[PDB]
Design a protein around this nucleic acid. Structure first.
Ligand SMILES: [Mg+2]
Ligand SMILES: [Mg+2]
Ligand SMILES: [Mg+2]
Ligand SMILES: [Mg+2]
Ligand SMILES: [Mg+2]
Ligand SMILES: [Mg+2]
Ligand SMILES: [Mg+2]
Ligand SMILES: [Mg+2]
Ligand SMILES: [Mg+2]
Ligand SMILES: [Mg+2]
Ligand SMILES: [Mg+2]
Ligand SMILES: [Mg+2]
Ligand SMILES: [Mg+2]
Ligand SMILES: [Mg+2]
Ligand SMILES: [Mg+2]
Ligand SMILES: [Mg+2]
Ligand SMILES: [Mg+2]
Ligand SMILES: [Mg+2]
Ligand SMILES: [Mg+2]
Ligand SMILES: [Mg+2]
Ligand SMILES: [Mg+2]
Ligand SMILES: [Mg+2]
Ligand SMILES: [Mg+2]
Ligand SMILES: [Mg+2]
Ligand SMILES: [Mg+2]
Ligand SMILES: [Mg+2]
Ligand SMILES: [Mg+2]
Ligand SMILES: [Mg+2]
Ligand SMILES: [Mg+2]
Ligand SMILES: [Mg+2]
Ligand SMILES: [Mg+2]
Ligand SMILES: [Mg+2]
Ligand SMILES: [Mg+2]
Ligand SMILES: [Mg+2]
Ligand SMILES: [Mg+2]
Ligand SMILES: [Mg+2]
Ligand SMILES: [Mg+2]
Ligand SMILES: [Mg+2]
Ligand SMILES: [Mg+2]
Ligand SMILES: [Mg+2]
Ligand SMILES: [Mg+2]
Ligand SMILES: [Mg+2]
Ligand SMILES: [Mg+2]
Ligand SMILES: [Mg+2]
Ligand SMILES: [Mg+2]
Ligand SMILES: [Mg+2]
Ligand SMILES: [Mg+2]
Ligand SMILES: [Mg+2]
Ligand SMILES: [Mg+2]
Ligand SMILES: [Mg+2]
Ligand SMILES: [Mg+2]
Ligand SMILES: [Mg+2]
Lengths: 271, 46, 93
RNA sequence: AGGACCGAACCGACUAAUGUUGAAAAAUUAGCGGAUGACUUGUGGCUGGGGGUGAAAGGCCAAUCAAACCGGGAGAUAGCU
RNA sequence: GCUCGCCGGAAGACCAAGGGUUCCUGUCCAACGUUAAUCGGGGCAGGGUGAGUCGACCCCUAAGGCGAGGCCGAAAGGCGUAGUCGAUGGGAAACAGGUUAAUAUUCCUGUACUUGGUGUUACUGCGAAGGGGGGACGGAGAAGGCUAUGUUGGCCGGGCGACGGUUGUCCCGGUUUAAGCGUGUAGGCUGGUUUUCCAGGCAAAUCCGGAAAAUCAAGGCUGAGGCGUGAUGACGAGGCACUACGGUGCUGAAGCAACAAAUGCCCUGCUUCCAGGAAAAGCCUCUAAGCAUCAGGUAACAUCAAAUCGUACCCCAAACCGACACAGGUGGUCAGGUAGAGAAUACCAAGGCGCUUGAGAGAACUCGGGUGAAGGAACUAGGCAAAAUGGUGCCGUAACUUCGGGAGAAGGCACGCUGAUAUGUAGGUGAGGUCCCUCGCGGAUGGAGCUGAAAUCAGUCGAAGAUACCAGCUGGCUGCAACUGUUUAUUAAAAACACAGCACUGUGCAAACACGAAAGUGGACGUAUACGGUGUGACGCCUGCCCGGUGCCGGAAGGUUAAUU
C-alpha cells in the first residue's frame, strides 16, 4: 500500500511510504544471515573510489538463492520478509526434505504457495526452468547469463525480462532497459515479475531519510573552486563550459561502453 | 581550549615505537641515522 | 623441589621499619627484602629451609626506586621486592 | 508519530561590553541557537602532500596550508637593498 | 580555638586516561612560591603500595594490521590465501566489620565462593579441526511490581534552657547490618510426552530440520523483590579514664512500623515502527576416524594449586593538555533536605573551601552595578545598549493556509493566610480480623492506621500574594531562502552549501566509473524500480522561439590522410 503522511511537521509533509502488511514482523532466519560491514565507498587503498557513500543503518546480509538448482523437489513459502540489502522482498521457502532457503519474492507469491525448479517444473510464477523449457513470450526474472552461474538480470523490485525469440542454442531477451540480448538457452530463469512494484512510489520526504540509507550529500561541481572541479570558479553564478565529470569527461551524452568481448551478444542497444 | 598534544601511550608506541620503526626499511633507516648520530634515546619506547 | 642454591640466593635481608616490627608483633609476619625474580613459592621454601620455621602465606610487592640527586646529577635507585611472610603461630623467628 | 514544541546536562557561537605587553597566541560576563537527531561523545583503526579529506569556506591535514613538516640538491638564483 | 563568609548536579566523593613519589613522617628556608613564611606539590633523609575472587596477563573475536606458500611489480616493494595479531565488545569466583602516620574487596576477624590437577567409591561409550543449539544483540513508547532513598510516628538515651514562655501535642540524638545460602513470588516466554518414517545440515549422528500418528493439557524455561538465615554476632547515641589534649583503653540502650518513592531493578521484558538492528570463544548437545573391561566421561570423598605484573598519590586538577601554582580544555560513576515540573533556581546537609601581596584613603577618569524629576527614540548608520515582558488555571483569539497550522496570536480574570464544607474532603495505601483454597509469598470481604490534592463559601493582613531566585515583549507591511540541518578552527552563519523533489545523460555486469605501472579493490555479495555523472532545488501554475557557432549522437558513399610496403 502507498500512504501519504499527514503534515504534522515540515519533514513529514511530503513523505510517501510503502506499507506491505504481509511481511514477517519478527527477526530473519538466523542460519541464513551474515555480517557485512560498511565500506564508506573506500577501496583497499583506503581511498574513496565511489563518492557519496557512508553512514546509514547497520544491515545484516541475507544469503539468497540466485541459482535455484534444487531440481525436482517442491518447496512451500513460509513467509515474505524485508531485505535491507535490496529493493525486492524475499521469501523464505521450506523444502520438503527439511531444507530452508531464501528466494527473491515474485509478484503475487505468498505463504502456502508451492514452488519448484527443474526441466519438469510447471510454467507458473515462482518456478525456475532452463529457458529452452520456457515458452517464447513468457515473463521471467532472475535470469542467468551463464548456465549455473546464478540469476543476474531482472532482480530489482518490479523488474522482469521478456523472452522474445529462440534461435538454436540462444534465446533473445528484452531487458528492462529496452536492450535486446542473446543468452544461451540453458541459462535458467524464474517465471514472473519480481514483486514490490510499488517500491518506486516511495518519497523519502527529507534529507534524513537518505542519510538513513547511507547516501551522503552531493555537492554540485559549479559550487566548487577551479582547483576542485572543472565546473569550479566564477564571480557570481557562471558556467560557460561543456559539462563534464569531476575527472573532465563529457557527461551529457558521451558513450562510455567499450567491451568488444561481449559486443556479439547484444542484438540492439537500449538506445 | 583543546590543544594539539593529547597523550595516549598505546598510540605513542604503535606509531613511533621501536617495533614500529623496525617494521619497515625506512623506519630502520631512521634507527640507523639515530644510532650513527649517537642518540642516547633511540625511540619513544624508552 | 627447588634446588637449594636457588633458595640461598632468594633472601637478601630482613626489612627494618616501624611497620615491619609492628607486623611481626601483631601478625607473626616477618618482612624481608627478596630477589626480584623470587616467586612466593621460592620465598616460602627458602624461609622454611634456611630459617627452619613453618610458613603459612607469603605476600609480595615490588618497590620502585626513587629519583635522587648527587650534585645536580639525576640518578635512580634500583627497584626491589618486599615479602610479607606470615609464620605459623609458633614459629617465632 | 515527529530531522515536532518549551527547556537544563551536552553540543554550538548570533549581539554587545571587557580584555588587546590579556587570567587566555581566540577568552570572560550578560544575553543567544540546537537539544530523539542529517544529534552528541569515549576508545581503537584507515585515507599522506599535486596527495588526502571537504553538506564547498580554497576550508582542514599537530597554534604552519592557492600545495604540510623534516632532511638533502644548497653557499639555488638575486641586473635589487 | 571561637566567630564570619563561600561551594554543595560541586568548588563534595570516586573510576578511566595522563602524570610518576607529587603520598606519610622528621628536618631546613639559599633558590623556587608574583609579598613574608616558622608554611609548601620547594631542598635533604627515612618510611609507605601486601590479592585464587579488583585490574592486567589469559580464552575469544570487530574494524583494522601483519601475512608461509601465492599472484603482481625495474629494484625497493603492492595485494592477498592458510594462518596470526588486534578492544573500545563476549568469557570463572568475596562480602561485611576492624585496623596504619601513610595500603587494604589485598592486612586481621567473621562468614563465603570459583576453576583446575591428582588420589579413592560407585556408575559408564568416550572421542573433533566436523554438525546443530546457544551466546546474539535496533529505535521509540507505555504501564504495572519493586528497591535504593526520604518523611513522619513509635522506641531508646539525654534535656527543662543566658531574656517573656517551655513536664508537654516540648526539644536534641540515634534508630545500621553485606556477600552467600534456602524459599520461588509480581511478572515474561512457551503446549508437553511417546513412538515411526525422510532427496536437507561437505561424512555420520540418538542432535537439528521435515513429515505422520498415539496420548495427555498442565509440564518446562526465565524472574525483580520480599521472607528466613548469615547475625546470641558486628555496629551503635552516649557514658566512664588517660593525654605525648592528636587520639586511644573500656562499656554500650533502642535498633520498629506506616507512608512517599526514582532516571536504579524485573526489563536482553512487553507494545509498536522501519531506517530492519556484530563476531568468535567459553557453554550445551551430536557424532567421524580412533580406542574399545585401557582410556575417557558422571557425581561423591580427600588432597594439591590458583603463578607473574599493577595497587602510594593527583585525577574538571597547583600533580593531566595549555612555556606559568595560567579565569581555558578533559570520558565515566555517585546523587541528601526545604521549596520547586526539574539534574533549573534559592538556601542548606555530608564534605570542601576564603581562590599566596597586604594596609589605608574615599579626587578626576576607567570597569561592574543601583536609583532618578519632567519628557519618552527627540539618540543613532541602526532603539546599539538598556529598560520591559516573563508562572499556572480559566475565558478568549484575526488575515491567510499546504487544513497540520498561523497560536502561548492578540487580550483579559484569578492567585497570600485562617476557618468551614470535612477537627483531613475526593483520591491513593491499606493493617488486625473473618470466609474460603486446587495450601502459599494464597483468593473474597472488611476496613483501623497512614497519606492527600483541588474547589467553594466566609473572614483576614500588606502599597503590593506567579511578592525572592527563576521566568516569552507584542503587532502591521515587505525582499531572500521551502522547511530541520551545514560553513570560512582564530574579523563573514548568510540570500552561500546541503536538502527531499525534478530532469538530462552514461551504464547489460568482468557495468559505467574510481584508486592502482600491475595483481587487485571500491561500485556490490548490488543488476536498469539499479548504480555513476551533471544541472535544478519543498509545493502550486508553468517552463515559449533558435541546431547558424561549440559540444555531443548517428551516418560513411565522396575528397584528404600515419606507420607499413
Ligand atoms: Mg553520487
Ligand atoms: Mg541530487
Ligand atoms: Mg565558493
Ligand atoms: Mg581545472
Ligand atoms: Mg554573473
Ligand atoms: Mg556568457
Ligand atoms: Mg592473604
Ligand atoms: Mg600483588
Ligand atoms: Mg526538535
Ligand atoms: Mg563549528
Ligand atoms: Mg555564554
Ligand atoms: Mg526552534
Ligand atoms: Mg529547546
Ligand atoms: Mg573565493
Ligand atoms: Mg592549523
Ligand atoms: Mg608548487
Ligand atoms: Mg646546485
Ligand atoms: Mg644564498
Ligand atoms: Mg621529589
Ligand atoms: Mg604533603
Ligand atoms: Mg619569597
Ligand atoms: Mg616536598
Ligand atoms: Mg582480519
Ligand atoms: Mg598484506
Ligand atoms: Mg612471502
Ligand atoms: Mg587472538
Ligand atoms: Mg576492553
Ligand atoms: Mg589513602
Ligand atoms: Mg524501602
Ligand atoms: Mg588508593
Ligand atoms: Mg594561585
Ligand atoms: Mg587552572
Ligand atoms: Mg545549581
Ligand atoms: Mg568609587
Ligand atoms: Mg559608571
Ligand atoms: Mg536601573
Ligand atoms: Mg532607596
Ligand atoms: Mg527619568
Ligand atoms: Mg517619573
Ligand atoms: Mg509614552
Ligand atoms: Mg531620529
Ligand atoms: Mg540627530
Ligand atoms: Mg538589544
Ligand atoms: Mg536587563
Ligand atoms: Mg526591495
Ligand atoms: Mg534556509
Ligand atoms: Mg537553521
Ligand atoms: Mg571566523
Ligand atoms: Mg562569526
Ligand atoms: Mg569487481
Ligand atoms: Mg541554485
Ligand atoms: Mg532559485
Amino acid at each position: 500500500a502507498v500512504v501519504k503522511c499527514k503534515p504534522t511537521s515540515p519533514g513529514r509533509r511530503h513523505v510517501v511510504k510503502v506499507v506491505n502488511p504481509e511481511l514477517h514482523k519478527g527477526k530473519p532466519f538466523a542460519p541464513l544471515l551474515e555480517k557485512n560491514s560498511k565500506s564508506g565507498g573506500r577501496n583497499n587503498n583506503g581511498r574513496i573510489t565511489t563518492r557519496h557513500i557512508g553512514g546509514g543503518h547497520k544491515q545484516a546480509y541475507r544469503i539468497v538463492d540466485f541459482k535455484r538448482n534444487k531440481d525436482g523437489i517442491p518447496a512451500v513459502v513460509e513467509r515474505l520478509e524485508y531485505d535491507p540489502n535490496r529493493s525486492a522482498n524475499i521469501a523464505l521457502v521450506l523444502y520438503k526434505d527439511g531444507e530452508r532457503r531464501y528466494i527473491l519474492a515474485p509478484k503475487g507469491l505468498k505463504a502456502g504457495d508451492q514452488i519448484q525448479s527443474g526441466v519438469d517444473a510447471a510454467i507458473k510464477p515462482g518456478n525456475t526452468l532452463p529457458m529452452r523449457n520456457i515458452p517464447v513470450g513468457s515473463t521471467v526474472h532472475n535470469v542467468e547469463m551463464k548456465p549455473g552461474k546464478g540469476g543476474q538480470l531482472a532482480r530489482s523490485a518490479g523488474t522482469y525480462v521478456q523472452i522474445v525469440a529462440r534461435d538454436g542454442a540462444y534465446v533473445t531477451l528484452r531487458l528492462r532497459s529496452g536492450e535486446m540480448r542473446k543468452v544461451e538457452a540453458d541459462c535458467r530463469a524464474t517465471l514472473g515479475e519480481v514483486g514490490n512494484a510499488e517500491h518506486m512510489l516511495r518519497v523519502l520526504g527529507k534529507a534524513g531519510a537518505a542519510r538513513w540509507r547511507g547516501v551522503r550529500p552531493t555537492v554540485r561541481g559549479t559550487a566548487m573552486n577551479p582547483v576542485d572541479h572543472p565546473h569550479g570558479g566564477g564571480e557570481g553564478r557562471n558556467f560557460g563550459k561543456h559539462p563534464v565529470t569531476p575527472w573532465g569527461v563529457q557527461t551529457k551524452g558521451k558513450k562510455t561502453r567499450s567491451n568488444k568481448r561481449t559486443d556479439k551478444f547484444i542484438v540492439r542497444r537500449r538506445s | 581550549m583543546k590543544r594539539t598534544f593529547q597523550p595516549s601511550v598505546l598510540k605513542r608506541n604503535r606509531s613511533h615505537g621501536f617495533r614500529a620503526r623496525m617494521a619497515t626499511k625506512n623506519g630502520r633507516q631512521v634507527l640507523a641515522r639515530r644510532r650513527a648520530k649517537g642518540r642516547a634515546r633511540l625511540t619513544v619506547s624508552k | 623441589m627447588i634446588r637449594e642454591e636457588r633458595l640461598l640466593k632468594v633472601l637478601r635481608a630482613p626489612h627494618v621499619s616501624e611497620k615491619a616490627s609492628t607486623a611481626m608483633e601483631k601478625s607473626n609476619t616477618i618482612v624481608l627484602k627478596v630477589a626480584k625474580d623470587a616467586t612466593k613459592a621460592e620465598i616460602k621454601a627458602a624461609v622454611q629451609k634456611l630459617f627452619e620455621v613453618e610458613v603459612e602465606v607469603v605476600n609480595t610487592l615490588v618497590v620502585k626506586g626513587k629519583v635522587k640527586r648527587h650534585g645536580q646529577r639525576i640518578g635512580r635507585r634500583s627497584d626491589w621486592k618486599k615479602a610479607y611472610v606470615t609464620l605459623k603461630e609458633g614459629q617465632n623467628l
